[PDB]
């Protein structure tokens, strides 16, 4: 190891420093709430009528499980491009509201 | 330390750091140069008998 670090084939008497020391993790733990309420995306997207531009409505989505996999499964969803989060990474995060 | 200060607990971060050359190799050499010299100052002042 010290031969490789010093880029020489022989090392003279002394004290030399080499690679660091670290302890690898043993396993992994993942924690998330227990609600399973299946947020109503289809209610919003497949609504019979939509509001006007000048009087756009605000809807609250909370206390439910978000699943955008089935949402993106729809063919005619074209104009989809997101700023804060990459669009493919919406199934592994959490939001306040 | 080279990496744990910059890319601590991020294995993929260290891979990108290798593309910046031999930066911290200088730092380990430079910081060692100070440390060894500090012992020589004490030898010069006191060790005279």
């Amino acid at each position: 190891e010290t031969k490789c670090t010093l880029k020489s084939f022989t090392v003279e008497k002394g004290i030399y420093q080499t690679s660091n020391f670290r302890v690898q993790p043993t396993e992994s733990i993942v924690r998330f709430p227990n609600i399973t309420n299946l947020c109503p995306f289809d209610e919003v997207f497949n609504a019979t009528r939509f509001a006007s531009v000048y009087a756009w409505n605000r809807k609250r989505i909370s206390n439910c499980v978000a699943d955008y996999s089935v949402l993106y499964n729809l063919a005619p969803f074209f104009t989809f491009k997101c700023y804060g989060v990459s669009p493919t990474k919406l199934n592994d995060l959490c939001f306040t509201n | 330390d080279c990496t744990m200060y910059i890319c601590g607990d991020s294995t993929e971060c260290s891979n990108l750091l290798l593309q910046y050359g031999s930066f911290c190799t200088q730092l380990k050499r430079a910081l060692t140069g100070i440390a060894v010299e500090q012992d020589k100052n004490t030898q010069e002042v006191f060790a005279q008998v």
Partner: protein, 49 residues
């Protein structure tokens, strides 16, 4: 990493690697200056002895 796509997160992560990397050099350069005045003061102490 987990919030942005890997295609352009390199641009974001690069501007943060350089930001921390430049911080270390300023610290090291300070140490070389400080080590210069201490060594210039240990020789005076050795001469006094």
């Amino acid at each position: 990493f987990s919030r942005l796509d890997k295609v352009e997160a390199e641009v974001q992560i690069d501007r943060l690697i350089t930001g921390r990397l430049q911080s270390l050099q300023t610290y090291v350069t300070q140490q070389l200056i400080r080590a210069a005045e201490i060594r210039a003061s240990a020789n005076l102490a050795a001469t006094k002895m």
